[PDB]
């Protein structure tokens, strides 16, 4: 998966996440056409309770049917302030997308990070199953980990999560200023 964000001088914003699912999709290409086929079918629940490539589970709601669109976690998002564009944000990462995107938004809104700071800041992840609190290398110091373990989290350090490309727009006396961040992580 990959996410891209665009904002222009007229006040349009476009936030696109698109994918062939896994890295290089199904790994099979169309002969004569030169392009890789998605493996998006794995985003369905293929058997109730069976975990897919992201450890995601399902039953009836996300069962396969002809013409049905498989459930996604993609979260291209626009945040508005006073009806003006404020953030354009999204990320790849399967099940980790939802939590990546929310942390970037919370970092700006709750913690007053600029967009570069918001994107670079270490990320955690909880997806219910598996029952673990996933963190990043160097992202949580001992004191915090010890307090969270005491509450009963099982903390695991895993590869970095996401690849956020985000824009922040701020009003100026004349027009706007656009600030951008790419993500120092490059998951995919």
């Amino acid at each position: 998966t990959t996410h891209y964000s665009v904002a222009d001088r007229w006040g349009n914003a476009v936030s696109v996440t698109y994918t062939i699912n896994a890295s290089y999709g199904s790994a099979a290409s169309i002969d004569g056409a030169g392009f890789l086929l998605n493996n998006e079918m794995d985003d369905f629940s293929i058997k109730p309770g069976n975990p897919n490539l992201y450890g995601l589970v399902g039953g009836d709601a996300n069962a396969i049917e002809a013409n049905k669109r498989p459930l996604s976690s993609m979260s291209p998002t626009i945040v508005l302030k006073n009806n003006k564009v404020f953030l354009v944000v999204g990320s790849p990462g399967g099940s980790r997308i939802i939590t990546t995107v929310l942390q970037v938004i919370s970092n700006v809104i709750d913690y007053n990070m600029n967009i570069s700071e918001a994107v670079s800041a270490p990320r955690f992840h909880m997806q219910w199953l598996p029952d673990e609190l996933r963190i990043e290398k160097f992202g949580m110091p001992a004191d915090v980990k010890d307090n969270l373990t005491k509450m009963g989290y099982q903390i695991v350090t895993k590869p970095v999560m996401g690849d956020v490309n985000a824009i922040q727009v701020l009003p100026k006396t004349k027009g706007s200023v656009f600030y951008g961040s790419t993500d120092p992580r490059k998951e995919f």
């Binding site: 696109v16 290409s29 996300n62 396969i64 498989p70 709750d110 913690y111 490309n165 600030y179």
Partner: protein, 342 residues
């Protein structure tokens, strides 16, 4: 951060694609114009993820105040069935849903790019796609990261004659960092799209190629599937967080719904008070996540086919209920979580 004070920004995970989007802005195109150019550029320069063989979503805020979502997610083929990835004994067939032709849904990216362009863009597809075509025909340098991801995909590529032809050098050798990667057949396909629009992908020669290669290789996508592929302009899911409006992707994505749900739960605490990385703040978010993902597993799917209680999941009152179950210094183990909380 990156900065612009004139035409805006177009940002992606590949500098060649970003540069292409940025040029569109510099040359007077709007955000949708640049996004179409980027979507095709990344199909050439970032084949691990950028694509014309997949699909996705666009969330758009328009100059006039309107907020819209474009669903160009892949569809299960007409021949798809509930247990298509299971064996005689009802057991998962290892890698059937992941590797090869049966793992594919009907591609939506090309329809999606044309849809947004036609409705909200200002430049011709023919022009926006030229930079991608140039990169396919003339080539680009394999990056350090790409060398790594291609290396990792080697044993998957090796199963399919078509991919061995496109993603290896002669003798099925990995591309190395700095190698020039040329994609002539891909340029043929893009050139069909340049000349004929999305029908250049979904009908005619490329549709024939797709159908016949599917049949040869145990896939099920047909010309009928391709001609029937439809994007859907959908209402985005909308929420608020501390005075900000959140606009995100609705079903068939779960993302926007659970994003708004989790933030709704978090809104009940003053996170700013303890600041970034405080265990008390991480605990509130993580507990909200826990409930949201449990909810996801039961309630979420394509709303065209199943009932998805989006409004209930994004209801602030539901979020307040979740928040009230959160204990100062202990978790609700996942085994004790009840989707919907009843």
């Amino acid at each position: 951060p990156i900065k612009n004070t004139k035409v805006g920004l177009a940002l992606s995970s590949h500098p060649l694609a970003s540069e292409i989007g940025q040029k569109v802005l510099e040359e007077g195109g709007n955000a949708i114009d640049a996004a179409v150019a980027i979507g095709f550029a990344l199909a050439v320069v970032h084949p691990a993820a950028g694509n014309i063989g997949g699909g996705g979503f666009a969330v758009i805020h328009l100059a006039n105040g309107e907020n819209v979502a474009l669903d160009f997610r892949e569809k299960a083929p007409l021949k798809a069935t509930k247990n298509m990835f299971l064996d005689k004994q009802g057991n998962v067939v290892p890698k059937l849903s992941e590797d090869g032709y049966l793992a594919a849904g009907v591609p939506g990216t090309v329809a999606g790019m044309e849809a947004m362009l036609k409705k909200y863009g200002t430049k011709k597809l023919s022009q926006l796609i030229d930079p991608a075509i140039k990169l396919a025909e003339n080539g680009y340098a394999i990056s350090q990261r790409q060398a790594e991801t291609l290396k990792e995909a080697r044993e998957r590529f090796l199963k399919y004659s078509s991919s061995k032809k496109y993603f290896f050098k002669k003798g099925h050798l990995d591309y190395q960092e700095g190698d020039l990667f040329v994609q002539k057949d891909l340029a043929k396909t893009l050139n069909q799209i340049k000349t004929l629009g999305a029908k250049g992908f979904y009908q005619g020669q490329v549709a024939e190629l797709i159908e016949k290669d599917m049949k040869k290789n145990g896939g099920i996508i047909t010309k009928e599937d391709l001609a029937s592929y439809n994007v859907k302009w959908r209402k985005p899911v909308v929420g608020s967080y501390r005075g900000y409006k959140i606009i995100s992707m609705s079903p068939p994505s779960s993302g926007g719904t659970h994003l708004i749900q989790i933030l709704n739960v978090m809104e009940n605490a003053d996170l700013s008070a303890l600041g970034y990385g405080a265990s008390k703040n991480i605990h509130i978010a993580a507990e909200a996540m826990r409930q949201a993902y449990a909810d996801r597993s039961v309630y979420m799917g394509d709303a065209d086919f199943v009932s998805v209680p989006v409004d209930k999941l994004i209801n602030k009152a539901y979020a307040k209920k979740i928040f009230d179950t959160i204990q100062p210094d202990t978790v609700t183990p996942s085994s004790q979580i009840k989707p919907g909380m009843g």
